[PDB]
């Protein structure tokens, strides 16, 4: 009983003044819908977005719809940021396995979602494609659904699934995923690659995110073996490995000889691997991101990066300072359920500076009001271009020693001081 | 094949140089054995102390220890913070529950663990009695164990039992418990316990600690019934609900009808109840302290409490700047697993004050170098003499808002001020 829609605006139209919205996330969001929205808007009030980190969703950040519609993000992304630092809009700190809970619990109400779907099978069956995330709890507990039909989403296997007579409206048309290459080789890199690599073992549990440093890390894994994969997400770092016979999931005890994610992000030929193959399970964040469910797969390998570090091993990564800057995710789900894991190990991998090289990240203290994502009890490794430092089980002092160690020389000495001066160790 | 000596410095005498060692902590700290070693390493050197926190060992806090043994703490007290602040012992921050595998992961080694136990039975076994903590773990991976049999030690029931041949030395002494009773009713506290008691719903899983805050909270549960236990550990204030009927476990799925906790600090009243008691377990906090199994049982209530809360919900409780008050502890376990249990609150409990009403718990950001313990995405309430906040899912500018509403009237403006001059948020 869905109406099929004759344009993207036609499909927007049922959404009224006030309502609470969701839209899909990530590499999945409904930029086809989102732009018809950036002017059915317009005639509305009250609204309210719900989110994490969007893609090509610029358009409903003009200052045009300041009044009429408003960005709650549980985690902030490129469009955004200027809207919160700016005050514009919200941030929600919550973990992101939290927010299927906060959706079903009832917490937190839905009017209508927003999502990107594949056509629907002989069965009348959707897939929500390379992003299952939150948006399939969303799904459960929305008032109604919109769904932008796309030829080119791929046919993820895993809880992606949805029925077509779920959806109040349907638009159809074949649109771009966004690719996202935004990545880019580097000196750096390399370096935090090579570090991060020595410390992954044969057989072990990967978890990474996007950019040049879990690449280099993925170019120095071309030698291992039996490796697995449970991750958040994955782009072209790990597709390479697979295709290199290097990943087969063979060690894992949950979904063993399958990759399991929340959702993905790369290039189209990913994207191609990642449609309708039986191997690839994209998974609901709700468990994916589980602690209690990561911790089963032995020799969990995690690695995140991070904003900011202290002398004592404080991780700030979703903000600089008061400035929100994107999210607490699920770093340190992975990182504690990589702690409880059999001979799991967590890492840490940041530059050593930023800035252009003017900004140590790591600090003496963090910036005042620096969101801690991760906590000092957590943390395991931390790597950067310059070596690794184990703060597990560390003193304060023997924390601070091994970090000043891996922070960009040009700073050591300013450390060094505050590591006695603010801290009042003796190292 | 244990040595039964005839004094304590007999028994410390084992103890040679360069050792790293571990103490019962909580209540049953050796007393009688911290003593003689006040002694017996005078003559030694290099001795590392491992421990969490501890009653009555402020002779091993004398400056002429200095040189010979040096305080490595989980968890900072009494008799270590002045060491710590003055850079004389280390702080080593890590989850409680992460302790027991800290040891059994080898990756701490302890020559020897100094204990207090019951009177070893027709079968030669003995009890941890009221702390179980991880010195059973320590017991476990301790090269030898030396201790304190004690007739006041209750036999409790639970994972603190362990042979005597496990013992190098032993030494025998009835000695008298820490009944700790430095709490003290309040008209804050009472204020506080008023509105936590609100949250508190029949059938709850309770989860508190020691205090005036814990005790007022518990003096307004007696028309509450069918409460359970499932806490770090507990105090009189407990005791007396139970034998007013509003606690007996019937609600929870995880060791129904007992209490458990990983161990218990009050009157001689209670160690009275707890001794040899078939309804109360003491269990390892490896165990107790797991989120994984604090979520099995529904309705749980996590109330802990804190040093200072910024207007975000940033929770810091182990510290006062870089001033090492305590340690992490595990509230945030608890939180977190509250947030995980079904229908499941968590609350952080604090005076709106502090330094005589001058300070404000609640500041617009924290001090410089705080120690993070539980995170803004981890909380859940906050409450005070003024009111509850609840920052689960709220934004920012929300969280601000209802944290100044419980903050001290006279601190209202300042925060409300900074809310926008430090954070950027309009209210
Ligand atoms: S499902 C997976 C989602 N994430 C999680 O679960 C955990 C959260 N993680 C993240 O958000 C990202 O991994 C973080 C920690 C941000 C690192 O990612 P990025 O690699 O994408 O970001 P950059 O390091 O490249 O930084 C972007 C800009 O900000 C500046 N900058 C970095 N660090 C600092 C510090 N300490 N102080 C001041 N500025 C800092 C850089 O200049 C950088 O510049 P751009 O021009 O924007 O690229
Ligand atoms: S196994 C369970 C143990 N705990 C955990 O797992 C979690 C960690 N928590 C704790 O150890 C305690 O719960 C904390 C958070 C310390 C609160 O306990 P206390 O109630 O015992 O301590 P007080 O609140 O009474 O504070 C002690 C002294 O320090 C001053 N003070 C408190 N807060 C501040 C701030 N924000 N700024 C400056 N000073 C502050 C008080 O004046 C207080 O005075 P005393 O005379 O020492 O009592």
Known sequence: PAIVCQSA???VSLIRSGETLWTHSMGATPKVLLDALAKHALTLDNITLLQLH???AESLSHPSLLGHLRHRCFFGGVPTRPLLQSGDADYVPIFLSEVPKLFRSGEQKIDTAIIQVSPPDKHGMCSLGISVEATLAACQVAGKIIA???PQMPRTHGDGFIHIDRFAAVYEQSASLP??????????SLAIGQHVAELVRD???LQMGIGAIPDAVLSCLTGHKDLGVHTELFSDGILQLVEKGVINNTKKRFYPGKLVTGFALGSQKLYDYVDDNPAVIFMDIEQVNDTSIIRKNPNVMAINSALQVDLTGQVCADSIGTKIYSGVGGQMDFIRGAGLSEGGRSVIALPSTAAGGRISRIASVLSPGAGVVTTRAHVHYIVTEYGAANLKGRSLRERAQALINIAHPDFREQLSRDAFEV???NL
Chains 1, 2 share one sequence.
Do not use: K, R
């Not at 690719?179 to 750096?188: E, K, L, P, R, Y």
């Open 54 to 56: 969007t893609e090509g």
């Open 179 to 188: 690719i996202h290459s935004f990545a880019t080789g580097d000196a750096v």
């Open 203 to 205: 057989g072990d549990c």
């Open 148 to 150: 932008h039909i796309n």
């Open 9 to 11: 605006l036609e499909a």
């Open 423 to 425: 801290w009042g160790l």
